[PDB]
């Protein structure tokens, strides 16, 4: 969970806490993942559905090729 | 669920403070404590605000009310 500054990112701008556009620093707390389990599971279901649809299309293509072959 | 966990933590902290106050009912010169809490809200650069709910409850401080006690 570490990042570095690349060309697209720009350059590291140093600053203090609660100064300018920076935020604040709180002791005794930690950050969890910024994810929502409901959204992740729903996206998982939708991705599986799309994968099944694409596999069906590929199967249709293969069946058409095999039908053409048997002539 | 983390907001509910924060609420549970705040309630348990208040419970512990009240338990300490009750336990120290006979200690000489003891001063009670009061639990004060505060709301939590994010300050992201691009915050929708109207479409963003709260962030739970955070314990602010445990006070040390110094009002004069009774004398025996």
Tab-separated table of C-alpha atoms in Angstrom:
chain	number	residue	atom	x	y	z
A	1	UNK	CA	0.000	0.000	0.000
A	2	UNK	CA	2.727	2.419	-1.056
A	3	UNK	CA	2.899	4.820	-3.989
A	4	UNK	CA	5.641	6.749	-5.770
A	5	UNK	CA	5.580	9.877	-7.922
A	6	UNK	CA	5.902	9.177	-11.646
A	7	UNK	CA	5.845	11.472	-14.680
A	8	UNK	CA	2.052	11.380	-15.043
A	9	UNK	CA	1.542	11.893	-11.306
A	10	UNK	CA	3.737	15.013	-11.291
A	11	UNK	CA	6.031	16.008	-8.431
A	12	UNK	CA	5.693	15.559	-4.683
A	13	UNK	CA	4.403	18.761	-3.068
A	14	UNK	CA	5.498	18.945	0.564
A	15	UNK	CA	3.446	20.687	3.221
A	16	UNK	CA	2.336	20.681	6.828
A	17	UNK	CA	-0.864	19.380	8.445
A	18	UNK	CA	-4.038	21.495	8.287
A	19	UNK	CA	-2.279	24.040	6.069
A	20	UNK	CA	-3.515	25.172	2.677
A	21	UNK	CA	-5.166	22.304	0.809
A	22	UNK	CA	-3.800	19.586	3.102
A	23	UNK	CA	-5.899	17.652	5.592
A	24	UNK	CA	-5.467	16.935	9.279
A	25	UNK	CA	-3.596	14.204	11.147
A	26	UNK	CA	-5.457	12.252	13.832
A	27	UNK	CA	-3.698	9.934	16.267
A	28	UNK	CA	-5.237	6.691	17.469
A	29	UNK	CA	-7.031	5.910	14.194
A	30	UNK	CA	-6.404	3.823	11.088
A	31	UNK	CA	-7.787	3.816	7.554
A	32	UNK	CA	-9.652	0.780	6.260
A	33	UNK	CA	-10.171	-0.124	2.618
A	34	UNK	CA	-12.419	2.310	0.756
A	35	UNK	CA	-14.587	-0.475	-0.653
A	36	UNK	CA	-18.244	-1.441	-0.358
A	37	UNK	CA	-18.878	-5.183	-0.174
A	38	UNK	CA	-22.365	-4.895	-1.673
A	39	UNK	CA	-21.046	-3.077	-4.741
A	40	UNK	CA	-18.149	-5.519	-5.130
A	41	UNK	CA	-20.440	-8.562	-5.015
A	42	UNK	CA	-22.932	-7.022	-7.452
A	43	UNK	CA	-20.106	-6.160	-9.850
A	44	UNK	CA	-18.833	-9.729	-9.469
A	45	UNK	CA	-22.235	-11.088	-10.503
A	46	UNK	CA	-22.450	-8.720	-13.472
A	47	UNK	CA	-18.918	-9.583	-14.609
A	48	UNK	CA	-19.745	-13.288	-14.447
A	49	UNK	CA	-22.862	-12.660	-16.536
A	50	UNK	CA	-20.854	-10.744	-19.153
A	51	UNK	CA	-18.201	-13.479	-19.231
A	52	UNK	CA	-20.903	-16.098	-19.806
A	53	UNK	CA	-22.409	-14.021	-22.622
A	54	UNK	CA	-19.035	-13.616	-24.340
A	55	UNK	CA	-18.329	-17.340	-23.983
A	56	UNK	CA	-21.711	-18.023	-25.588
A	57	UNK	CA	-20.790	-15.757	-28.506
A	58	UNK	CA	-17.455	-17.550	-28.918
A	59	UNK	CA	-19.270	-20.891	-28.884
A	60	UNK	CA	-21.612	-19.610	-31.599
A	61	UNK	CA	-18.614	-18.578	-33.712
A	62	UNK	CA	-17.012	-22.004	-33.265
A	63	UNK	CA	-20.259	-23.773	-34.157
A	64	UNK	CA	-20.597	-21.681	-37.317
A	65	UNK	CA	-17.017	-22.484	-38.325
A	66	UNK	CA	-17.583	-26.200	-37.717
A	67	UNK	CA	-20.822	-26.123	-39.721
A	68	UNK	CA	-18.969	-24.487	-42.613
A	69	UNK	CA	-16.233	-27.123	-42.300
A	70	UNK	CA	-18.732	-29.984	-42.743
A	71	UNK	CA	-19.463	-29.243	-46.393
B	1	UNK	CA	-21.176	-1.170	9.518
B	2	UNK	CA	-18.195	0.895	10.653
B	3	UNK	CA	-20.553	3.692	11.703
B	4	UNK	CA	-22.452	1.193	13.855
B	5	UNK	CA	-19.156	-0.043	15.295
B	6	UNK	CA	-18.242	3.552	16.153
B	7	UNK	CA	-21.607	3.925	17.870
B	8	UNK	CA	-20.992	0.734	19.844
B	9	UNK	CA	-17.558	2.005	20.877
B	10	UNK	CA	-18.995	5.349	21.993
B	11	UNK	CA	-21.761	3.661	23.990
B	12	UNK	CA	-19.268	1.322	25.648
B	13	UNK	CA	-16.958	4.230	26.494
B	14	UNK	CA	-19.857	6.055	28.144
B	15	UNK	CA	-20.756	2.841	29.977
B	16	UNK	CA	-17.179	2.494	31.244
B	17	UNK	CA	-17.109	6.133	32.364
B	18	UNK	CA	-20.360	5.703	34.289
B	19	UNK	CA	-19.071	2.459	35.811
B	20	UNK	CA	-15.910	4.227	36.979
B	21	UNK	CA	-17.983	7.048	38.476
B	22	UNK	CA	-20.157	4.531	40.333
B	23	UNK	CA	-17.160	2.509	41.539
B	24	UNK	CA	-15.467	5.633	42.915
B	25	UNK	CA	-18.589	6.617	44.894
B	26	UNK	CA	-16.703	6.319	48.205
B	27	UNK	CA	-13.207	7.471	47.203
B	28	UNK	CA	-12.223	10.641	49.059
B	29	UNK	CA	-11.716	13.715	46.903
B	30	UNK	CA	-12.645	11.940	43.670
B	31	UNK	CA	-13.987	14.016	40.784
B	32	UNK	CA	-16.464	12.492	38.346
B	33	UNK	CA	-15.888	12.196	34.605
B	34	UNK	CA	-18.186	12.986	31.687
B	35	UNK	CA	-17.934	11.545	28.178
B	36	UNK	CA	-18.348	14.010	25.303
B	37	UNK	CA	-18.532	12.885	21.678
B	38	UNK	CA	-18.325	14.516	18.264
B	39	UNK	CA	-19.530	13.843	14.739
B	40	UNK	CA	-17.268	12.574	11.951
B	41	UNK	CA	-17.309	13.829	8.375
B	42	UNK	CA	-14.924	13.474	5.447
B	43	UNK	CA	-13.198	16.431	3.788
B	44	UNK	CA	-12.223	15.012	0.407
B	45	UNK	CA	-11.244	17.383	-2.387
B	46	UNK	CA	-14.234	16.296	-4.495
B	47	UNK	CA	-17.007	15.686	-1.962
B	48	UNK	CA	-20.611	15.397	-3.129
B	49	UNK	CA	-21.782	16.350	0.394
B	50	UNK	CA	-25.474	16.188	-0.522
B	51	UNK	CA	-25.004	12.564	-1.635
B	52	UNK	CA	-22.584	11.557	1.146
B	53	UNK	CA	-23.870	10.349	4.538
B	54	UNK	CA	-22.171	10.813	7.894
B	55	UNK	CA	-19.090	9.020	9.127
B	56	UNK	CA	-20.194	7.880	12.565
B	57	UNK	CA	-19.317	9.212	16.015
B	58	UNK	CA	-15.877	9.897	17.496
B	59	UNK	CA	-15.030	10.280	21.170
B	60	UNK	CA	-13.842	13.838	21.771
B	61	UNK	CA	-12.674	13.876	25.395
B	62	UNK	CA	-13.450	12.499	28.839
B	63	UNK	CA	-14.178	15.541	30.978
B	64	UNK	CA	-13.097	15.951	34.608
B	65	UNK	CA	-15.946	17.995	36.113
B	66	UNK	CA	-14.485	19.718	39.176
B	67	UNK	CA	-17.636	20.900	40.928
B	68	UNK	CA	-17.384	20.928	44.715
B	69	UNK	CA	-18.416	17.672	46.350
B	70	UNK	CA	-20.207	17.055	49.611
B	71	UNK	CA	-18.331	17.132	52.913
B	72	UNK	CA	-18.459	14.545	55.685
